[PDB]
Amino acid sequence: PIPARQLFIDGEWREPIKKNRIPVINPSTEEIIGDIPAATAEDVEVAVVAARRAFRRNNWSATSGAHRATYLRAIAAKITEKKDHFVKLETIDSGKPFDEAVLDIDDVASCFEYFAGQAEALDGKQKAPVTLPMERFKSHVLRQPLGVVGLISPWNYPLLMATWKIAPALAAGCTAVLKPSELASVTCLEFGEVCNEVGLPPGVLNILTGLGPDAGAPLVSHPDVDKIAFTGSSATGSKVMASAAQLVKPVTLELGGKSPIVVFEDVDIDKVVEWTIFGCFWTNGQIASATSRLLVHESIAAEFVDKLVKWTKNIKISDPFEEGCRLGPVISKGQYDKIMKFISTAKSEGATILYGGSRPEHLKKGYYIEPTIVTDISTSMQIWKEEVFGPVLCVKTFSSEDEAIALANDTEYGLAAAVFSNDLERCERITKALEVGAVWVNCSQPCFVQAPWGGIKRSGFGRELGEWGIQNYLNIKQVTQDISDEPWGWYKSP
Amino acid sequence: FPIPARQLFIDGEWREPIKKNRIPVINPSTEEIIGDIPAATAEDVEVAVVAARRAFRRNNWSATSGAHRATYLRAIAAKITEKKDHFVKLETIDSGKPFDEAVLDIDDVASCFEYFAGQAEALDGKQKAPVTLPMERFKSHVLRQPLGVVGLISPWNYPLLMATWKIAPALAAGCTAVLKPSELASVTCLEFGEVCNEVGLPPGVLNILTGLGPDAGAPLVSHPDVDKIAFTGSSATGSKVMASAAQLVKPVTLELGGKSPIVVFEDVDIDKVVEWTIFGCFWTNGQIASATSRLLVHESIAAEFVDKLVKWTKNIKISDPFEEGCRLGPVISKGQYDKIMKFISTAKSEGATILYGGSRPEHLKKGYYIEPTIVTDISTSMQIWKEEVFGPVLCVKTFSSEDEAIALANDTEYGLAAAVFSNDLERCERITKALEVGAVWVNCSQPCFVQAPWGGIKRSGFGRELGEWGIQNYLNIKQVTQDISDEPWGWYKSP
Numbered sequence: 009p010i011p012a013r014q015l016f017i018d019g020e021w022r023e024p025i026k027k028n029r030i031p032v033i034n035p036s037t038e039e040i041i042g043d044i045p046a047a048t049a050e051d052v053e054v055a056v057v058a059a060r061r062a063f064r065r066n067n068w069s070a071t072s073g074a075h076r077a078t079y080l081r082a083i084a085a086k087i088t089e090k091k092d093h094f095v096k097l098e099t100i101d102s103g104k105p106f107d108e109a110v111l112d113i114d115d116v117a118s119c120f121e122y123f124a125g126q127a128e129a130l131d132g133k134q135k136a137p138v139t140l141p142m143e144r145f146k147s148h149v150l151r152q153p154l155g156v157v158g159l160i161s162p163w164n165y166p167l168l169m170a171t172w173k174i175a176p177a178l179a180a181g182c183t184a185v186l187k188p189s190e191l192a193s194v195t196c197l198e199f200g201e202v203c204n205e206v207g208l209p210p211g212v213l214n215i216l217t218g219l220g221p222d223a224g225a226p227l228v229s230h231p232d233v234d235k236i237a238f239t240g241s242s243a244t245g246s247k248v249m250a251s252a253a254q255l256v257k258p259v260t261l262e263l264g265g266k267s268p269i270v271v272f273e274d275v276d277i278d279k280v281v282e283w284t285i286f287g288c289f290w291t292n293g294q295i296a297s298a299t300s301r302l303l304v305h306e307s308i309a310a311e312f313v314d315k316l317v318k319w320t321k322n323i324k325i326s327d328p329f330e331e332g333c334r335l336g337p338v339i340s341k342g343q344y345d346k347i348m349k350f351i352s353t354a355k356s357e358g359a360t361i362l363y364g365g366s367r368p369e370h371l372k373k374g375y376y377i378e379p380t381i382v383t384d385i386s387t388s389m390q391i392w393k394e395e396v397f398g399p400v401l402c403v404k405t406f407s408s409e410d411e412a413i414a415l416a417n418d419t420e421y422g423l424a425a426a427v428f429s430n431d432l433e434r435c436e437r438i439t440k441a442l443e444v445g446a447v448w449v450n451c452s453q454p455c456f457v458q459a460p461w462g463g464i465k466r467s468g469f470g471r472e473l474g475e476w477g478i479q480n481y482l483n484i485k486q487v488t489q490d491i492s493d494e495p496w497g498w499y500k501s502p
Numbered sequence: 503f504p505i506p507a508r509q510l511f512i513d514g515e516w517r518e519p520i521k522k523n524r525i526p527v528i529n530p531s532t533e534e535i536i537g538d539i540p541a542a543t544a545e546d547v548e549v550a551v552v553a554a555r556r557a558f559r560r561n562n563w564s565a566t567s568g569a570h571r572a573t574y575l576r577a578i579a580a581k582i583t584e585k586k587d588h589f590v591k592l593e594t595i596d597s598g599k600p601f602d603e604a605v606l607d608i609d610d611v612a613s614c615f616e617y618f619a620g621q622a623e624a625l626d627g628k629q630k631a632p633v634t635l636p637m638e639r640f641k642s643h644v645l646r647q648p649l650g651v652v653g654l655i656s657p658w659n660y661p662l663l664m665a666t667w668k669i670a671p672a673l674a675a676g677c678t679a680v681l682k683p684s685e686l687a688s689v690t691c692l693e694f695g696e697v698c699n700e701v702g703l704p705p706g707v708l709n710i711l712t713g714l715g716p717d718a719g720a721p722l723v724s725h726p727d728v729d730k731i732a733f734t735g736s737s738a739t740g741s742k743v744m745a746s747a748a749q750l751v752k753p754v755t756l757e758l759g760g761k762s763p764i765v766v767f768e769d770v771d772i773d774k775v776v777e778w779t780i781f782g783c784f785w786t787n788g789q790i791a792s793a794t795s796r797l798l799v800h801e802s803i804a805a806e807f808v809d810k811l812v813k814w815t816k817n818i819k820i821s822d823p824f825e826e827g828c829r830l831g832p833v834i835s836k837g838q839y840d841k842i843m844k845f846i847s848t849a850k851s852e853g854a855t856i857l858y859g860g861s862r863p864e865h866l867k868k869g870y871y872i873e874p875t876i877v878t879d880i881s882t883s884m885q886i887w888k889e890e891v892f893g894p895v896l897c898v899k900t901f902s903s904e905d906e907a908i909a910l911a912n913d914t915e916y917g918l919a920a921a922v923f924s925n926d927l928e929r930c931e932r933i934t935k936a937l938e939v940g941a942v943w944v945n946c947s948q949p950c951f952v953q954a955p956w957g958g959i960k961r962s963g964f965g966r967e968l969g970e971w972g973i974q975n976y977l978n979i980k981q982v983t984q985d986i987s988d989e990p991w992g993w994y995k996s997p
């Protein structure tokens with residue numbers, strides 16, 4: 009059985025005011041395994057009032073970064089301590105292979121530990137001097153918490169994506185309301201328990217589960233929420249930013265993508281094929297930065313794709329708890345239907361389904377989709393243009409570096425890309441030319457909390473993580489003082 | 503001296519607007535038409551953005567080094583300094599600010615390009631900055647690349663300086679740009695085009711479209727090939743701009759309005775502080791975003807201070823901005839003029855006291871002149887206390903408690919700036935931290951240095967311009983992460 013919880017507001021478990029709840033479904037069995045609170049606008053009001061109250065106390069926001077760091081480290085210890093509990097819940101809820109979930113939960117701890125360090129570095133950045141040319145004045149910078157922030161996250165790494173926002177927010181001195189995805193809210197609710205166990209002050213983090221328009225939208229439109237951190241689809245990001253615009257409320261947008269993986273002839277085919285499959289099929293294909301468009305040099309394309317299908321066919325598809333699982337079911341019935349629709353229109357538009365594109369025969373139940381390889385691609389095809397968010401990879405060949413770069417940048421998106429070539433000068437040339445927020449060289453998808461992360465173009469804007477993460481939650485306050493004790497001397501005294 | 507007549511500045515040449523419209527230039531001092539400017543339309547926005555995109559796709563600009571771009575930025579500063587007298591004169595007649603104020607603006611324009619030249623060179627040093635990773639298998643660094651084509655939209659209260667705050671870092675970053683300055687004061691910005699050709703700025707790197715906000719500004723915001731908008735203007739326009747940009751999930755920065763508090767405690771030299779409060783609210787003819795327009799003064803010295811405040815104010819020379827000793831000129835236009843007069847009138851109507859001014863000066867019977875206005879007996883529910891007036895109009899209220907002053911000062915939807923006066927420096931810093939604002943002046947009001955970050959919170963917008971923050975607004979922070987192992991990943995089972 010799974011946990012059963014209420015909303016987490018002001019250090020305590022509270023029932024949604026309208027008392028609606030929605031199903032939790034296991035994507036591996038299609039069965040109802042529990043349910044979660046379904047917050048509405050009334051719950052948002054209560055949660056942000058608590059967040060505002062917590063922000064105004066003398067125990068969090070104006071405290072030192074080192075002080076908040078003890079909490080972040082304690083959270084990291086708690087998570088690591090309760091590792092089995094979270095991994096199992098994440099696996100049951102999200103359908104991702106057990107081995108993937110342990111890395112997620114490992115990364116959650118890593119991220120809180122990383123931002124404890126960032127909270128500490130903050131102290132030394134306080135009253136950072138600004139050198140002015142006039143001896144009459146002095147200037148420095150204060151870095152203060154912005155205030156109450158709304159954090160809205162997706163389901164593909166349920167607790168990790170929440171953590172990418174929570175850790176920086178707390179590190180900065182903000183208080184927060186989290187609204188995780190309705191497709192995978194179990195571990196994020198469990199996180200409320202962790203907060204209470206580390207004695208995180210009441211109202212510092214509030215957790216509201218529910219649907220986007222019912223719990224999320226009121227969070228974005230609330231007069232007393234100073235900032236929104238949003239991760240989701242480009243279409244939703246547009247709505248969120250449009251709403252924020254009414255109150256001129258700042259947002260960050262981590263949105264969708266259709267990232268290319270470019271592969272030249274001078275590579276180790278077997279090493280690149282594994283990265284290619286990690287690039288497009290890992291996390292069951294539900295990666296924002298998934299390298300879902302393979303561009304491979306025509307001189308090695310036939311051999312490459314042959315070994316691609318051979319590795320792909322060796323991927324163990326099973327219940328995510330089965331020993332050796334390397335591909336689980338996609339997250340939901342809705343997603344399953346969308347992905348299957350993408351596959352059919354691909355076939356209808358003239359694409360070749362070279363492998364997969366179907367349900368695994370041995371698995372009667374669960375939203376299981378075979379890793380799918382799609383060839384004979386035209387660039388006008390939907391499957392080439394739009395984010396599928398399923399284990400579906402498109403293949404095109406190129407003749408020259410010139411054509412590789414043209415094809416790689418031929419997308420409205422711009423989150424990431426990967427480039428493979430033993431000529432590292434070539435790699436750098438491609439790297440600079442890619443219209444993208446992140447470039448992997450001779451790999452695809454490694455994600456470190458140390459490095460800034462974000463897209464351009466229709467993949468959104470702003471950078472989370474690394475030294476950039478905490479500054480999304482800061483008021484950069486200028487303070488400049490007249491130290492002369494002299495009259496200004498612009499006007500005439502009477 | 504003559505007022506130039508100039509076409510749009512596009513792709514390094516002077517181009518008539520496609521629909522061939524022009525709009526008047528009015529001298530605020532005389533209410534008379536002194537000239538005219540191009541009135542760009544959406545059609546012109548399209549050709550400008552195309553030119554900027556083409557200029558970006560070369561590697562003589564976007565892909566070159568910061569040091570390369572810096573030679574142009576310094577060339578530009580030197581050219582502005584060389585033509586200083588010309589720009590000062592045009593800025594004065596066009597904007598309506600005192601000549602002495604315009605002199606400073608143009609000094610600051612040149613200083614700003616110099617500062618960002620330095621920031622362009624520092625950018626080079628920053629390229630490929632190592633990022634330490636825990637796994638010896640992977641190495642990471644950051645590339646700081648120009649975002650692309652940017653839309654830069656600026657207000658009339660410091661015409662060339664406000665434009666420059668955007669141009670200098672955009673170009674330093676390596677972006678190409680379309681500037682649309684205010685239709686109320688476009689002369690000097692258009693003139694900036696001639697400077698660009700004189701330093702050999704590559705065609706299309708900066709394009710200048712003058713015209714109406716809706717007609718020229720909005721199509722720039724909603725254009726599909728503009729990657730980011732840098733906006734300075736009213737909170738109301740800021741909302742429009744961000745709502746428009748949101749349709750394309752287009753990043754924006756917003757430098758909006760304010761209703762900034764000036765907090766004066768009892769331990770001060772009253773004549774020193776009085777000059778700073780008039781400077782804080784009446785300088786630039788009251789047309790300052792960060793204007794300290796809400797005077798919060800200790801009840802202890804309230805009486806004396808307001809008395810001296812009034813005396814200094816009576817002594818402010820109001821005149822045509824070219825007149826020797828001018829310390830207050832006309833507000834920018836008829837519409838602002840009327841707006842401000844209406845603010846004052848409804849303030850009377852709600853029972854506020856017009857202690858001084860509030861009226862058009864006797865000896866000036868044409869021009870948008872308004873006496874510096876001191877309004878007292880305030881309630882916090884009055885329009886004049888809540889809303890940005892943008893004229894030489896100061897509200898006054900007393901306080902007894904420190905916690906009262908803080909509460910009154912933060913009792914605003916805005917959050918741009920603030921000023922606190924106290925000989926007690928421990929008290930200043932305490933106040934500084936508590937104010938819900940992006941900038942705090944201590945024992946002064948309004949001095950603006952390019953070296954320090956600038957912007958607000960709350961309804962005053964978000965984002966920081968200038969200082970070491972200015973350049974970043976125009977960058978793609980690119981993570982580059984590479985596998986140096988040449989070993990199998992070993993996640994999947996090899997076939």
Ligand SMILES: NC(=O)c1ccc[n+]([C@@H]2O[C@H](COP(=O)([O-])OP(=O)(O)OC[C@H]3O[C@@H](n4cnc5c(N)ncnc54)[C@H](O)[C@@H]3O)[C@@H](O)[C@H]2O)c1
Binds near residue numbers: 160219241264
């Ligand atoms: N760029 C990144 O870093 C990143 C990381 C993870 C996932 N993603 C992306 O997320 C998308 C898939 O996840 P999704 O299906 O969860 O996204 P979504 O956009 O459907 O939902 C995301 C979140 O926004 C909420 N939401 C929905 N409508 C809302 C509204 N009107 N107001 C406020 N909130 C609302 C949802 O409830 C959810 O918590 C993909 O497009 C993928 O690329 C991006």
Ligand SMILES: NC(=O)c1ccc[n+]([C@@H]2O[C@H](COP(=O)([O-])OP(=O)(O)OC[C@H]3O[C@@H](n4cnc5c(N)ncnc54)[C@H](O)[C@@H]3O)[C@@H](O)[C@H]2O)c1
Binds near residue numbers: 683685
């Ligand atoms: N925060 C700051 O740093 C700062 C500095 C200077 C001025 N300001 C503010 O600016 C305002 C005064 O200037 P303003 O009157 O020129 O402001 P405004 O917002 O009316 O206009 C500013 C610019 O935007 C344009 N514009 C107008 N409507 C538009 C639309 N729908 N779409 C796109 N563009 C549009 C105008 O043509 C002009 O160039 C005041 O509110 C003041 O506080 C702020």
Ligand SMILES: [K+]
Binds near residue numbers: 101193
């Ligand atoms: K689920």
Ligand SMILES: [K+]
Binds near residue numbers: 528529530596597686
């Ligand atoms: K004018």
